[PDB]
């Protein structure tokens, strides 16, 4: 491990994070929206699961056009969630339970309701005009409508620009129309961003930040038209000119130094960047400890599988090997470096992992949920568990499109309708994809009980902000799973116990090697830590599947798996349907 600087222990390397989506976690006052007192009331549940830290998605004052990722005030909690004091009490309670607290840092853009933007948009001459990207129309079209400055597509569909009638110019918004991008080329803007979004929260005791689209802050000068890579779309990906831009490392170094200089008590702050995609070299420039940029990053290749590189909401075939390789992209690059990785399958933007990568049928949802837990338990990096994942939550089924809340659904739907028609092949493909891929599969209220109609998320008379998944009725809920020794929840508790007990090779293991990479069913690998070898054999299939241990001997002991403990033959070399096993040799 001397040749593996990545094995140097840090609290944030070996912490298991639990991600909370505040709108959907726990409602304490029957208004149908989750809130801070609701979260506080369930911290003991999170601690008992085996979490070491929490990350709460944005709870700052926000119109909710993008459910909190459109921030009107970095220094004020959204009143529906609580007061600033409620948040501080929540951070303290988290801390007194022995857990760390990270907050979501959303500074690529703010709400158009933010005072900075209200000032910026007021005139062409005010001191905050250049805190955003304002450009005149390219010209006007034959119908008299202004033409946007370039052809860039919003992440949620349609143009990435919004016309302002008052000043007769467009402003850039890569996200929804009320999320204007902040201009990081303006130094006064950067400094104000740091004071408000970063310094305020450091002053109030956060242990770190999850950094939202951290790879988008640097725009290529001129904001040029993007190449036409999609010939069936008016608007084109801005990625070449917005993703990992020329100043992105300069910006992250400056922000890292701001944090180091603002912390008052010498505590160690973790930053995890939601960086989307980056070559391994770029990842190393971000996460190498000696670069003083990020602690670690999320890379989305593993959650991209089965979706068109041209459009998230067009499904394409994938095979197990594609997902194996994509998962390995999170962590192989850190081998023999001072970098660090993340490990996760779910978050507030993703559908449920059982539905995507296991088998969500009544027959197999439990065992395949446990398989995914076995897999995640064994991988190197900071592990993240998303609310409901520990219950084996699955996608909702058979929802009409109008039932979806997500702005990403609404905007993409309207873009397709405008470009192709509601009754088009393009629309049919979109509707097929949302049933599998929508962010809303992550966003239905947390299922605490089998109580009708709100599953313990709120009182029985409350109207939840968003519809409940019917799965609560089928026993996917905290109350039912605690009592069931065979539940996915109880399994996750054991998986986190196993991971911690063997953390040297589970969290800090290196020299990862695939075994039988091409196998369409078997996901198998080895890792090392000094004299120890970990071997995983994981059967992502309803078929039984053979495996081999490289250099097989009697030294490989079965240490963890998802089939009943007393019924597994460790010496056998065939996995039952959806069976996973971790062996360790020392
Ligand atoms: O703050 C806007 C937006 O940023 C983050 O996600 C960016 C993008 O990431 C992936 O590509 C997903 O598939 C997209 O749906 C996301 O828009 C936040 O995580 C996201 O919640 C937010 O809306
Ligand atoms: Ca509430």
UniProtKB/Swiss-Prot annotation:
The record marks 349 as: Transition state stabilizer. It comes from the Eukaryota. The keyword Hydrolase applies. It is an enzyme of class 3 (hydrolase). Coiled coil: none annotated. It catalyses: Hydrolysis of (1->6)-alpha-D-glucosidic linkages in some oligosaccharides produced from starch and glycogen by alpha-amylase, and in isomaltose. Induction: Expression is increased in response to the addition of maltose, isomaltose, and alpha-methylglucopyranoside. Changing residue 215 to G: Does not alter substrate specificity. Keywords: Glycosidase, Hydrolase, Maltose metabolism, Mitochondrion. InterPro entries: Glyco_hydro_13_cat_dom, Glyco_hydro_b, Glycoside_hydrolase_SF, O16G_dom_2. GO terms for cellular component: mitochondrion. Major isomaltase (alpha-1,6-glucosidase) required for isomaltose utilization. Preferentially hydrolyzes isomaltose, palatinose, and methyl-alpha-glucoside, with little activity towards isomaltotriose or longer oligosaccharides. Does not hydrolyze maltose. PANTHER family: ALPHA-AMYLASE FAMILY MEMBER, NEUTRAL AND BASIC AMINO ACID TRANSPORT PROTEIN RBAT. This is Oligo-1,6-glucosidase IMA1.
């Amino acid at each position: 491990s001397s040749a593996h600087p990545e094995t140097e222990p840090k609290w944030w390397k070996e912490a298991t994070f639990y991600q909370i989506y505040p709108a959907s976690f726990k409602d304490s006052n029957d208004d149908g929206w989750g809130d801070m007192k609701g979260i506080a009331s369930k911290l003991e549940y999170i601690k008992e699961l085996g979490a070491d830290a929490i990350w709460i998605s944005p709870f700052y004052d926000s119109p909710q056009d993008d459910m909190g990722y459109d921030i009107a005030n970095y220094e004020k909690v959204w009143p529906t969630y609580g007061t600033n004091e409620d948040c501080f009490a929540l951070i303290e309670k988290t801390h007194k339970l022995g857990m760390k607290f990270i907050t979501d840092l959303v500074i690529n853009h703010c709400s158009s309701e933010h005072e900075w933007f209200k000032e910026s948009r007021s005139s062409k001459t005010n001191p905050k005009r250049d805190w955003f990207f304002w450009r005149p129309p390219k010209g006007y079209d034959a119908e008299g409508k202004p033409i946007p400055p370039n052809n860039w597509k919003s992440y949620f569909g349609g143009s990435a620009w919004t016309f302002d009638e008052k000043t007769q110019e467009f402003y850039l918004r890569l996200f929804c129309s009320t999320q204007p991008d902040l201009n990081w080329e303006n130094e006064d803007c950067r400094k104000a961003i740091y004071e408000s979004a970063v310094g305020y929260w450091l002053d109030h005791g956060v242990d770190g930040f999850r950094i939202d689209v951290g790879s988008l802050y640097s725009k290529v000068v001129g904001l040029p038209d993007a190449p036409v890579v999609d010939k069936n779309s008016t608007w084109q990906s801005s990625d070449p000119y917005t993703l990992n831009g020329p100043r992105i490392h300069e910006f992250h170094q400056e922000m890292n130094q701001f944090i180091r200089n603002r912390v008052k008590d010498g505590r160690e702050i973790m930053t995890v960047g939601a960086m989307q995609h980056a070559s391994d070299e770029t990842k190393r420039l971000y996460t190498s400890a000696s670069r003083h940029e990020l602690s670690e990053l999320f890379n989305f290749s593993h959650t991209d599988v089965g979706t068109s590189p041209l459009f998230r909401y067009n499904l394409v075939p994938f095979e197990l090997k594609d997902w194996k390789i994509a998962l390995a992209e999170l962590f192989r690059y850190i081998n023999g470096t001072d970098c660090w990785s993340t490990i996760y399958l779910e978050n507030h933007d993703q559908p449920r992992s059982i539905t995507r990568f296991g088998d969500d049928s009544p027959k197999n949802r439990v065992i395949s949920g446990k398989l995914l837990s076995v897999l995640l338990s064994a991988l190197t990096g900071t592990l993240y568990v998303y609310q409901g994942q520990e219950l084996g939550q699955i996608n909702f089924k058979n929802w009409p499109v109008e039932k979806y809340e997500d702005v990403e659904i609404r905007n993409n739907y309207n873009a397709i309708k405008e470009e192709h028609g509601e009754n088009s092949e393009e629309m049919k493909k979109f509707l097929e994809a949302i049933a599998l891929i929508s962010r809303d599969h992550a966003r239905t209220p947390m299922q605490w009980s089998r109580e009708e109609p709100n599953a313990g998320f709120s009182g029985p008379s409350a109207k939840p902000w968003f519809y409940l998944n019917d799965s609560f009725r089928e026993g996917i809920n905290v109350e039912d799973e605690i009592k069931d020794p065979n539940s996915v929840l109880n399994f996750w508790k054991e998986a986190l116990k196993f991971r911690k007990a063997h953390k040297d090779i589970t969290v800090y293991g290196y020299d990862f090697e695939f075994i039988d990479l091409d196998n369409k069913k078997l996901f198998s690998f080895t890792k090392k830590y000094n004299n120890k070898t970990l071997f995983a054999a994981l059967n992502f299939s309803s078929d039984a599947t053979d495996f081999k241990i490289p250099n097989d001997d009697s030294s490989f002991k079965l240490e963890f798996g998802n089939y009943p403990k007393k019924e597994v033959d460790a010496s056998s070399r065939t996995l039952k349907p959806w069976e996973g096993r971790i062996y360790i040799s020392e």
